[PDB]
Design a binder for this molecule. Structure first.
Ligand SMILES: Nc1ncnc2c1ncn2[C@H]1C[C@H](O)[C@@H](COP(=O)(O)OP(=O)(O)OP(=O)(O)O)O1
Ligand SMILES: [Ca+2]
Ligand SMILES: [Ca+2]
Ligand SMILES: [Ca+2]
Ligand SMILES: [Ca+2]
Ligand SMILES: [Ca+2]
Length: 901
DNA sequence: CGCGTAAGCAGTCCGCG
DNA sequence: GCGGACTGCTTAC
C-alpha cells in the first residue's frame, strides 16, 4: 500500500512525523527537512520556477527551517517579497506525499475519551486542576474497546468496584442499561489511588497513542484537566508524555470578550466533537450538553440520576461509572450517524494538511492551492497585511407581504463557485478593468458590452480566457465531489419516500429488510418486494434509508461549505489570495444574475399569459427566484385536476419543459453579454408549492425578506408521500423561540397553508386556553449570553442592559453565596423567563443555564412567579399576528351578522 | 478560534408638542 | 405607543 501521514509537527529544525508505512504499520520519524523559499530574479537568469503572474524566481535552499524563517524576516526588513510556502510542515507533506493520498481509516488510531472529577466547591477549573480525576473512559478504535480507569479511594470517598452485571440490567431492574452491544467491549480497571491510575493511564497512552483525539468538550475541559492534574502531582515532564514527542504548549484562545487556555499536544490531532458538530451539523442548538445533543440526534432518553453530580460518586458510584462509559459511547453513536470524523479525514488528506486544520477554510484552501501550483513549478506569493474593509454582498428582493397560493422556486446550483468558474475569477487571471455603468444598466442590457476580449463581471473586473485560473480549477474538483454525494443523498431521500408510501399498506408477514444500497434509486424488483414487506421490515429500511441520506448530507453540504468558503476567503484579510476585486467580482455578478433572470422570467411569462408589466417573480434572495404559478394553474382550471399530485406533475412538467429552457436562454445571453469563459449558471427547479386540491389552505405566505412559508409537494425531484412545510426565518426556525412555541406556531402555519382560516382559529383558541400547563422549560426563551460583566453594576443591571443579561443578574443574586448550584458561563446559552410584578427575585426576568433544570433552591419560586401572559404575548401572539396580517387572515373569528339568532 | 454579507426581530433609551 | 439610533442575537443566503 501507498504510505500516508498520520500527524506532522515542526519542532525547531526538525519535522516530526507519525505515519503509516508501506506495510500498514505505524512509525515515527524525525527529519531535518531543508525547506525552499523563493525570490524574484532577473529574466536573464534561467529558471524553471515562476510566480503565479509568470515572473521568474530563483529557489533558495536553506540549511534548516529557522534559517528560512530568519530569511523571511530579513526580506521584510529590506522590503522584498519572500515567496513560497512559509508553513514548512505543509511543504514537507507536499514533498513527502506527492500523489493523491489513499488512506486506510482502520490503521488510524481514533481515541474517544471522557473524564469524571468530583468537586464540592463548584466547577473544576482545568487550569487549577485541584480535585482528583476519579474516572476515565477511553475508547480505542483499533482495539474497539472501552478502557475504564476507576478510582476507588479518594479524599471525597472510598467506594466499591463497579459491577458490569448491574450495569447491563434494565433501569427497571435497578441497572444502568449500558447497551448490550458494548458490554463485552469494556475493559475495567479499578485503582486504589489516583497516582497509580494516572501512571497506568500514561503507560496505556504510550502503548496506544491517539492520532485523532476526540470526545465532548475534550479540548476545553478533559485534555487541559488531565494535563494540569498530572503536572500538579508529578511535574511537567510527566504531563508532556501525553504528546508522543514530549512537546506541549499552552495556547491562548482569544475572542471579542476575554480569552481561554488550551493545551496543544504536539503529534496529536485533537478534533473535539462539540466543535466538529457546530462546524459540520448545520444546526443551532438551544444547548450543547451531550445529553441534549444525544436526545436530538439519537432519540435516547436523558441519563438520569438523583442529587447533584458532586454527590453522585459517593451516593451511587455504580451509576457514576456506567454514565461515564455511556457518555463516551454516545459520541461514537452520533458519529456513526453524522460521520464527521470520516469527513474530516477525507478533507484533511485531500488538502494535505494537519487533520485539525479542517476547522480553517483559509488553511485548507492555502494548502490545496499550494499543492496545485507546486505541480506546475509555480510559486505562491507571500501573505500580506490588509486592513479589514467592508464589501457588498448579495441582492435580496423586497417581497409584497401576502399569501401566495401556487409557487415554483428556482435557484442556481453552487452559485458562487459557479460564478468563479464561469467568469474565471482567480488571483492570476486578472486581465485589467473596464469602465462600469450602474448595475441597473447591465441588468436591463442597455450598458455597453464590457469587453470583446476578456471575461467580465459588472464590478469592473476583466479576466483572461485562454486558460483556467488555479481557483476555478481547484474549486471545480471539490464541486464535482460535492455533486456525487448530493446525488447519493437525494436518491436515499427518494428511496425513503417509496418506503413511506409502502407503509400505508404493510403485509401481515414475517420477513427481513432487503439488503440494498440506498444511495441508488430502487429498481422495479426492489419496489415490488417492498410492497410485500411487513411494517417491521419497512421501518428498519426507512431507518437505514434515512441514515444513508444523513451520510449523503454530511458529505455534500460540507463540501458545498468548503467551496463557498473559498469565495468568502477572497474577502478575509488573512487569506494569501485576499483580494476585494475578486470577492466583489463574485458578489456583484450574483446581483446582476438574479435581477437579470428576474426580468427574463417576467418577460417570458407575460408573453405566455399575453399580458404586460405583471410581476411573476414575487421574491428572490442571492441566487433564487420564486414564481407565482396561479395563472398557469388557472389557464387549465382547477376543475381539470384529478387530485393534488396531478397539478404537481403539471407544474413539474411546466418547470422542466418551458421554464428551465427559457431560464437557460436568458443566462446564455448574459454569459455572452459579459463574454464569460463558460456558461455555468444552472437555475434548476427547487420547490413546487400550493394548497391541497379542494382545500381552503392558503398555500404559502411572505411577511418580509428572509421570512416565508410554503406548502411543498416536490423538492428537487423528491415527491413526498405527505406535504412538507418549507419555513424560512420565521420564529418556528429560531433556536431563541421556546420549544413548545415553535411547535404551536408550526401547527398554526400548517393549518393556514393546508386547511385555512377557520382551522387556524380553532387551534389558536385551544393553545391560548391550555398553554399554562406547558412545562416551564418548553416555554422558556433561549439566548447566548455575552458580556455579563460589562452590564453587572454591583449585581444590578447597568445602562442598556440586555433583557437576557438582566435575567442572569437576577439569577446571580438569587443564588449568591452558593459554591454549589450552577453558574452561568459567559458566552454560553441561557433559558429566560419573565416574572410577574412584585416577585421575590426583585426583577422582571430570570435566566439560567440552558439544557438544565433550574436549581431546586429557586425552582418553586420561579414556577409560581412565571409570567405566562407576557410569555404568550411575546413568543406566540406577536409572531402569529405578524404571520396572519401578512396572509390577510385573522387568528380570532370576527363578529358577523350571523351572531344574531 | 475556525470563510463571506444581508437583514430580520427583541429590547433599551428617548423623542414626539 | 411607535419609530429611529443603537446593541445583541440569530438566520438566509
Ligand atoms: N454558509 C455560507 N457561507 C458563505 N457563503 C454562503 C453560505 N451560504 C450561502 N452562501 C452564498 C454562496 C452560495 O453559493 C450562495 C447561494 O446559496 P445556497 O443556494 O444556499 O448555496 P449554493 O448555491 O452554493 O448550493 P446549492 O447548489 O445547494 O443551491 O450564497
Ligand atoms: Ca460527566
Ligand atoms: Ca443555490
Ligand atoms: Ca404491502
Ligand atoms: Ca438559494
Ligand atoms: Ca438545485
Amino acid at each position: 500500500m501507498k504510505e500516508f501521514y498520520l500527524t506532522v509537527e515542526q519542532i525547531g529544525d526538525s519535522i516530526f512525523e507519525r505515519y503509516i508505512d508501506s506495510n500498514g504499520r505505524e512509525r515515527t520519524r524525525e527529519v531535518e527537512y531543508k525547506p525552499s523559499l523563493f525570490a524574484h530574479c532577473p529574466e536573464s537568469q534561467a529558471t524553471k520556477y515562476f510566480d503565479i503572474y509568470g515572473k521568474p524566481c530563483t529557489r533558495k535552499l536553506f540549511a534548516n527551517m529557522r534559517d528560512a524563517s530568519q530569511w523571511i524576516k530579513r526580506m521584510e526588513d529590506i522590503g522584498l517579497e519572500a515567496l513560497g510556502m512559509d508553513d514548512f510542515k505543509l511543504a514537507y507533506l507536499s514533498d513527502t506525499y506527492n500523489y493523491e493520498i489513499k488512506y486506510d481509516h482502520t490503521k488510524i488510531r481514533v481515541a474517544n475519551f471522557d473524564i469524571e472529577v468530583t468537586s464540592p466547591d463548584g466547577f473544576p477549573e482545568p487550569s487549577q486542576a485541584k480535585h482528583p480525576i476519579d474516572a476515565i473512559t477511553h475508547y480505542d478504535s483499533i482495539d474497539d474497546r472501552f478502557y475504564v480507569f476507576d478510582l476507588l479511594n479518594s479524599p471525597y470517598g472510598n467506594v466499591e468496584e463497579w459491577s458490569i452485571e448491574i450495569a447491563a440490567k434494565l433501569q427497571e431492574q435497578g441497572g444502568d442499561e449500558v447497551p448490550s452491544e458494548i458490554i463485552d467491549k469494556i475493559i475495567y480497571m479499578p485503582f486504589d489511588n489516583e497516582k497509580e491510575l494516572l501512571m497506568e493511564y500514561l503507560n496505556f497512552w504510550q502503548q496506544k497513542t491517539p492520532v485523532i483525539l476526540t470526545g465532548w468538550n475534550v479540548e476545553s475541559f478533559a485534555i487541559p484537566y488531565v494535563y494540569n492534574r498530572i503536572k500538579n502531582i508529578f511535574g511537567e515532564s510527566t504531563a508532556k508524555r501525553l504528546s508522543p514527542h514530549r512537546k506541549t504548549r499552552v495556547k491562548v484562545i482569544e475572542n471579542m470578550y476575554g480569552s481561554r487556555e488550551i493545551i496543544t499536544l504536539f503529534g496529536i490531532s485533537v478534533l473535539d466533537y462539540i466543535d466538529l458538530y457546530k462546524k459540520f451539523s448545520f444546526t443551532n442548538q438551544p444547548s450543547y450538553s451531550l445529553d441534549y445533543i444525544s436526545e436530538f440526534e439519537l432519540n435516547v432518553g436523558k441519563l438520569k440520576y438523583d442529587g447533584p453530580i458532586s454527590k453522585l460518586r459517593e451516593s451511587n458510584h455504580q451509576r457514576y461509572i456506567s454514565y461515564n462509559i455511556i457518555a463516551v459511547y454516545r459520541v461514537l453513536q452520533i458519529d456513526a450517524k453524522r460521520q464527521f470524523i470520516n469527513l474530516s479525514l477525507d478533507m484533511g488528506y485531500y488538502a494535505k494538511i494537519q487533520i485539525q486544520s479542517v476547522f480553517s477554510p483559509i488553511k485548507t484552501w492555502d494548502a490545496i492551492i499550494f499543492n496545485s501550483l507546486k505541480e506546475q513549478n509555480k510559486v505562491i506569493p507571500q501573505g500580506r497585511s490588509h486592513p479589514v474593509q467592508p464589501y457588498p454582498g448579495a441582492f435580496v428582493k423586497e417581497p409584497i407581504p401576502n399569501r401566495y397560493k401556487y409557487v415554483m422556486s428556482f435557484d442556481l446550483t453552487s452559485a458562487y463557485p459557479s460564478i468563479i468558474r464561469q467568469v474565471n475569477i482567480s488571483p492570476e487571471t486578472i486581465a485589467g478593468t473596464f469602465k462600469v455603468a450602474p448595475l441597473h444598466d447591465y441588468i436591463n442590457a442597455v450598458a455597453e458590452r464590457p469587453s470583446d476580449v476578456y471575461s467580465c463581471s459588472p464590478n469592473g473586473m476583466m479576466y483572461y480566457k485562454d486558460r483556467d485560473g488555479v481557483v476555478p480549477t481547484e474549486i471545480t474538483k471539490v464541486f464535482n465531489q460535492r455533486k456525487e454525494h448530493k446525488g447519493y443523498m437525494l436518491a436515499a431521500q427518494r428511496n425513503g419516500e417509496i418506503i413511506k408510501e409502502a407503509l400505508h399498506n404493510p403485509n401481515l408477514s414475517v420477513d427481513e429488510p432487503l439488503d440494498v444500497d440506498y444511495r441508488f434509486d430502487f429498481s422495479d424488483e426492489i419496489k415490488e418486494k417492498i410492497k410485500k414487506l411487513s411494517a417491521k421490515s419497512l421501518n428498519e429500511m426507512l431507518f437505514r434509508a434515512q441514515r444513508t441520506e444523513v451520510a449523503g448530507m454530511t458529505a455534500q453540504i460540507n463540501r458545498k461549505a468548503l467551496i463557498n468558503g473559498l469565495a468568502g476567503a477572497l474577502g478575509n484579510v488573512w487569506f494569501r489570495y485576499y483580494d476585494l476585486r475578486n470577492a466583489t467580482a463574485i458578489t456583484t455578478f450574483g446581483q446582476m444574475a438574479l435581477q437579470w433572470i428576474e426580468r427574463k422570467v417576467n418577460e417570458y411569462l407575460n408573453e405566455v399569459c399575453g399580458t404586460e408589466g405583471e410581476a411573476f417573480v414575487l421574491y428572490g434572495d442571492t441566487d433564487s427566484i420564486y414564481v407565482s404559478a396561479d395563472k398557469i394553474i388557472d389557464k387549465v382550471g382547477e376543475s381539470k385536476f384529478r387530485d393534488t399530485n396531478h397539478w404537481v406533475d403539471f407544474l413539474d412538467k411546466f418547470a422542466r419543459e418551458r421554464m428551465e429552457p427559457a431560464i437557460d436562454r436568458g443566462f446564455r445571453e448574459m454569459c455572452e453579454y459579459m463574454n464569460n469563459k463558460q456558461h455555468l449558471m444552472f437555475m434548476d427547479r427547487e420547490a413546487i408549492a400550493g394548497p391541497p386540491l379542494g382545500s381552503k389552505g392558503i398555500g404559502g405566505f411572505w411577511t418580509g425578506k428572509k421570512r416565508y412559508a410554503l406548502n411543498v409537494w416536490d423538492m428537487e425531484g423528491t415527491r413526498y408521500a405527505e406535504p412538507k412545510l418549507k419555513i424560512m426565518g420565521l420564529e418556528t426556525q429560531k433556536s431563541s423561540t421556546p420549544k413548545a412555541v415553535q411547535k404551536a406556531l408550526k401547527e398554526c402555519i400548517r393549518r393556514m397553508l393546508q386547511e385555512g382560516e377557520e382551522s387556524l382559529q380553532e387551534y389558536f383558541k385551544e393553545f391560548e386556553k391550555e398553554f399554562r400547563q406547558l412545562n416551564y422549560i418548553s416555554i422558556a426563551s433561549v439566548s447566548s449570553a455575552n458580556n455579563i460583566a460589562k452590564y453587572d453594576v454591583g449585581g444590578f443591571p447597568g445602562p442598556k442592559c440586555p433583557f437576557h443579561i438582566r435575567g442572569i443578574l437576577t439569577y446571580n443574586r438569587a443564588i449568591k453565596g452558593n459554591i454549589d448550584a450552577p453558574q452561568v458561563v459567559e458566552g454560553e446559552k441561557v433559558y429566560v423567563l419573565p416574572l410577574r410584578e412584585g416577585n421575590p427575585f426583585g426583577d422582571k426576568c430570570i435566566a439560567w443555564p440552558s439544557g438544565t433544570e433550574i436549581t431546586d433552591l429557586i425552582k418553586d419560586d420561579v414556577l409560581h412567579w412565571m409570567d405566562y401572559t407576557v410569555l404568550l404575548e411575546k413568543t406566540f401572539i406577536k409572531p402569529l399576528e405578524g404571520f396572519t396580517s401578512a396572509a390577510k387572515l385573522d387568528y380570532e373569528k370576527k363578529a358577523s351578522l350571523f351572531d344574531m339568532f
